[PDB]
Amino acid sequence: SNAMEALKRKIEEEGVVLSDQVLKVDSFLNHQIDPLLMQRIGDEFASRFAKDGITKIVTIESSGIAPAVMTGLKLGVPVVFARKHKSLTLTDNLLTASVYSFTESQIAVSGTHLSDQDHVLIIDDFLANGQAAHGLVSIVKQAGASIAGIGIVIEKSFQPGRDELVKLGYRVESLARIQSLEEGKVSFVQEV
């Protein structure tokens, strides 16, 4: 009945394990979007960061946008999405970060929409190797803003992304934590 249970159900029902490293969730998160699920997700992120003085959400196009906007809606704050490609109006005050895929690409945000007055919640769909998250952290730091934490819809706990961010002192709130995709099945991190 909570967002974590709903999300785990969806992953169990509709997620397709493609390999040891890849989970396909195109039916609800990455191509088709379940807006009601996104609202529950946003409400859960908002609940976790309710008392933390969030002024702004930062995410990256495209899959991050829906959970980010639902979080922004609940908290009553604006949402900024970083861009991966040249666009028509993203032309000045560019804050950029290099992101390499396991080669390298640039992501960008206009500093016009981020100030040192901001206390930012980063929201993203997947946490795997963590390079995009590090990039968003860099961009927020470049703006002189502080980071309240990182909200992730699906985390692959068996990849290094989470540990890197935690080591750097960041609060990581992952709604689904996957321990393994071995044997073509999703195994979640154990809960007591």
Cβ-contact 165, 130 below 8 angstroms: yes
Residues between 133 and 192 with contacts to ligand G4P, criterion CB under 6 A? 156
Question: At its nearest, how many Å lie between a second copy and the CB of residue 28?
Answer: 8
65 touches a second copy (CB under 8 A): yes
Out of 2, 18, 20, 168, the residue judged to bind a second copy by CB under 8 A = 18
Q: By CB under 6 A, is residue 58 in contact with ligand G4P?
A: no
For the chain, the first-to-last Cα distance in angstroms comes to: 18
Provide long-range contacts, Cβ within 8 A and 24+ apart, for 146-149. 146/118, 146/119, 146/120, 147/119, 147/120, 147/122, 148/49, 148/52, 148/53, 148/54, 148/119, 148/120, 148/121, 149/49, 149/52, 149/121, 149/122, 149/173
Check binding of 97 to ligand G4P (CB under 6 A).
Answer: no
Query: By CB under 8 A, is residue 184 in contact with a second copy?
Result: no
Positions in the binding site for a second copy (CB under 8 A): 18, 22, 24-28, 30-36, 38-39, 61-62, 65-66, 69-70, 72-73, 76-81, 83, 85, 87-90, 109-110, 112-113
